[PDB]
Amino acid sequence: NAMKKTLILGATPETNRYAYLAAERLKSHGHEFIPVGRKKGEVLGKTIINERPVIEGVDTVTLYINPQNQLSEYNYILSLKPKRVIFNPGTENEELEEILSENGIEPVIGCTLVMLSAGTF
Template sequence: MKRTLIIGATSNPSRYAYLAAQKLRNYGHPIILVGRKKGSALGEEIHLEKTNWEDVDTVTLYINPSHQPEYYDYIVSLNPKRVIFNPGTENPDFKNILLAKNIIPIEGCTLVMLSIGQY
């Protein structure tokens, strides 16, 4: 199972970040939720602070590229194997930073990847 950090997590069940959290959990992947607003989703706290979590395999992004620079150093410091840029989060500058740190950037959709067995 791949421990996944969701950045842009939300308590709103109609948002893709919430649906991804739900589906990741249904597939047995442990989740960590980080968001811009305090709350909870699926019984998990949405963290506002950038905690140094251990054993993060994947970071999946649900935040606009204009908000991503404040997370660059944080994500790199977690040393995940990959970062998924969900639709609307694509960011060539961050992609290049990740490649330089040997972190795999993936432009894809977490929900689709799970559905087709490519997560």
């Protein structure tokens, strides 16, 4: 499948964390990744964006923040108007899924890593 501009929400420099693993797989697959979150640092050469700039052309938001922490991000996710939002394990949030799909954004429950391997990313 095609290259997709992918924003990682919950990006972290900690190499054992799934948001880091995702950046590595996205990158090695050739997707442009954009690291956004509250943690300070750099992920594979990119400063993690600690503000919330409205970046144009995001295809996929891939979520690595827990449902409690998502509350403060709903309107930001909406303002990005992505084609798809991925709920990785432990981020599932039925309210946010409905709000997305209501607004014509496809919620997808799966693991970004599995999806890249399976060919369904």
